[PDB]
Symmetry: C3
């Protein structure tokens, strides 16, 4: 199987798994002390629930026998018939799902019932994630019309980003959101999460070539490039508006990482530089805008991942360099790729937002998404986990 | 040597090394602020001491020329005669030893003299760990009678688990153990440790195939499976008894990881599901039981690793699927494997508990294991390291 | 390209990248709460700035067409002409640069303007790092006269170490440095950084063989060996002088890691033991000495990396074992290698110290390195980032 290739993907899988709690730490540092445990716990739960559902039927629904090009059959339920390298792919893909669910927790920070999140997550994984994976990577209709997504610009970032926006709108602002700022209880904790996310992204984008080859190497180069550019942009903006806070710096880096994800294996360093530069700017604008509109999409999964993934997914159609991976974009003489990307981006963006909206309201109506005001007041660590973060 | 295989084991070795301080963080978050440094420091010391002893003679005693099938000779002392791939194996195995010693620190939390722990650790590594490794993996008597242990259900988990129980009983309860609860000073710190342990377990179980092949892939799949199942079980139990604390969730996940370790490369996903389900239940019961019996085996190395490793090691004899790795268990028509496992489990469990008991008392009699009451009062960070965790 | 080798270097690159924020956490725990964010932020900025400059021209200046054996041309600017495996090497090397810059932040702890550090870093990377890399690894004059540096004893440790000493002397002591001790605000945070540094060093030294072969395996063995020995030494010294603080333990381990870096792929375990033993002693003495001289080279980049790298680089000339990697040192009958090392060490030590001194003063004169007294008083988290570490 090429031990080298198996080695790299085994490693990449471990790396993406680390990103799940990595998201938890990243988010936890930004919420109040009384909700720190909850924020982290959500990422671990996201991992646990994802592994089970993926095995049970999630994998099959994403990559099983195609039906009308919109979803896969149940031929791989309980991994029936999944062997050898297919097992590794299943496992690697399983982790992409988990990270996606964790990113989404941005929209429910400090005020959701754990039980409700689990229910919603299970439904979302079933009706939004699996379909997307199938459409783009499971031989679905989007792949058929030529759409590309190297590492999940759409499958992972647009989905969680826009789903987060829908969820935030459904669950409502946190008490005191408009009145006064919620201060991050531990920026260092968030920076630890940020370090784990950058590190794990090596397996995320680099492992998406599914081999230890020139494409993986390219993905690693441009991934770091876009991250550095977007992080530099936010640093500049930070200075332009005051002082460069560390949160803005790593938030910018992540914008660049999300934007390059769908294009990591198709563009060159120059293209990577454009992608990161634009990502830094548009994502910052997106953040400012949702803030202006007073939407409590708390940790900016939308502005960063949603918008970053949207831009990067479209950028693929403009900058794909055939000398890099055969595929060519607009600037390389091929208008068709751009149209495939726009269709894919338009489709995934609308579906993620609208369907999540339906699922969120459904669950809210069925069991209620938000915790009581008093639980929100005492904090979810105590009220939802009967634990205290620090003593 | 197959660069791919060397690559994977090099990586797996790095991964297992990370698990050592990972154990330190995991444990540190659960003790009081005045003992945080001590708890972490112990894991680093465990690593340092293990590397030296392993090199000096530990490796040789585990994997050197067999003598009566119970121990290895000194032909590899100072790595004399260890070259090429044998060097990599030595290094990979070295890290298993280190993690084992760190897990054991559970039984001495908040009240042991560092010097005494070092002495005990050196003795334990010599008279308990090395023998076990030799018996099962060094061509010892247990391997000869057909016993199997894929990644250390017995060599690592039962040994540390039961040794921890013996040590706890010898050193005695912490002041105020029975009167009032000791609160974890930083659950987030513990969750960081938990994240590092899950991540490193990819190298632990996955690297035990000693190649980037189908067995490693299987080990990685079932390892994540069992972890998710057992973590889900503890989450359910947590809800059944109140609220699902994050500590219970990751403790359950670890129970599943310990249980699947001895079977990672022999069972299928369905078997992995059974193993994790039972592990979650029995380990939770074990925890409750040692608590009822008022034994201060502080961080549950026993209930989690001891019992989890015991179950998983026995489960190998029941669920080994020949279609997975040739070996077959009871349910697959082979009663013999079960008997080999029971013998191995009975032997390793009794020896670990009884011999550790002897060593602990010996050291206690020789130099005294426990710190003075006042040192316990002011905390070991100050009294044993003359340091203060946070300012 | 040997998927196995690409796999290992891809992984090693991820590992070295993690070391950058790893340095940030390591240092952050040792400074005051009011400067925690700043200390970490500096490492992330170091990474961001390094990636950009490396791509732009840093890589080319280090490994491009040689000119007079002191520097490389601009033939690889913007990675023009860099493809395949050369891209991976570029990326792997990029991370070495980033870690070096982060280590250097030791000398400006708690009192530097971020903008000034960036300017200085950019200049230093250009006039000190790139040249060194070229001299030793880019076919420069030092390589030509037979000097060796397996993983950066000189390129990374001596450079940052001595540059840090120069910077510290130029920027001046922190207010109250001589009067009273500055207490570490979070030793646990530092230990997390220490864990990440030890773990990442697997990719640092182990990946320097640029293949998953016997040399990488050796590097990994001796790297862990030297670390354990030096850490044990500091533990002993700690006991000899009082109690073994955890900071001394990991600081000793790092001394051993820095010392073995230039020799990781040339010496045997016995040589590794000598290197770590001496490193522990000389680095401890160096620390005591700079303290006696009242130099506020704050986090001992000099005593640990500077001196550790100096010793290890010289040790290569004494202990290189031809049976390990062909090269032989003094004790193995070859006096020439020792002379090459002394020349290289003398050259790199003097240049790093003197040129950094010039650059630091230049920048200080141009824009001023140090923050105002009041900013130093309120802390750089607030004054330089308008952020608060913990709430």
């Amino acid at each position: 199987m090429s031990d080298g290739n198996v080695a790299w993907i085994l490693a990449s899988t471990a790396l993406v798994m680390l990103m799940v709690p990595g998201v938890g730490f990243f988010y936890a540092g930004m919420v109040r002390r009384k909700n720190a445990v909850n924020m982290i716990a959500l990422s671990f739960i996201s991992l646990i629930i994802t592994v089970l559902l993926w095995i049970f039927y999630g994998y099959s629904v994403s990559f099983g026998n195609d039906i009308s090009g919109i979803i896969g059959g149940l031929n791989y339920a309980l991994l029936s018939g999944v062997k050898g390298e297919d097992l590794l792919f299943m496992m690697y893909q399983m982790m992409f799902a988990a990270v996606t669910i964790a990113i989404l927790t941005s929209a429910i920070a400090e005020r959701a019932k754990v039980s409700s999140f689990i229910l919603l997550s299970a439904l979302w994984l079933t009706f939004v994630y699996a379909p997307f994976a199938h459409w783009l990577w499971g031989g679905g209709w989007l792949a058929k019309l030529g759409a590309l997504d190297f590492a999940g610009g759409m499958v992972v970032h647009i989905s969680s980003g826009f789903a987060a926006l829908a969820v935030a709108m459904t669950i409502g602002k946190r008490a005191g959101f408009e009145e006064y700022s919620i201060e991050p209880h531990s920026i260092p904790l968030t920076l630890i999460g940020a370090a784990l996310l950058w590190f794990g992204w090596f397996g995320f984008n680099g492992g998406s070539a599914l081999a230890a080859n020139d494409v993986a190497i390219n993905a690693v180069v441009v991934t770091n490039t876009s991250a550095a550019v977007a992080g530099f942009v936010w640093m500049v903006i930070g200075w332009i508006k005051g002082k460069p806070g560390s949160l803005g710096i790593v938030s910018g880096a992540i914008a660049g990482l999300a934007a390059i994800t769908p294009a990591a294996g198709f563009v060159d360093v120059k293209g990577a530089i454009v992608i990161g530069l634009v990502a830094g700017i548009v994502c910052y604008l997106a953040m400012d805008f949702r803030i202006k509109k007073k939407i409590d999409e708390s940790l900016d999964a939308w502005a960063i991942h949603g918008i970053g993934g949207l831009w990067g997914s479209v950028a693929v159609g403009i900058l794909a360099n055939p000398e890099v991976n055969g595929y060519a974009g607009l600037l390389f003489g091929n208008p068709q790729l751009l149209v495939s990307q726009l269709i894919a981006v338009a489709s995934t963006t609308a579906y993620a937002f609208l369907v999540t909206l339906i699922l969120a309201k459904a669950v809210d109506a069925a069991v209620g998404l938000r915790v009581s005001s008093q639980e929100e007041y005492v904090g979810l660590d105590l009220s939802q986990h009967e634990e205290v973060a620090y003593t």
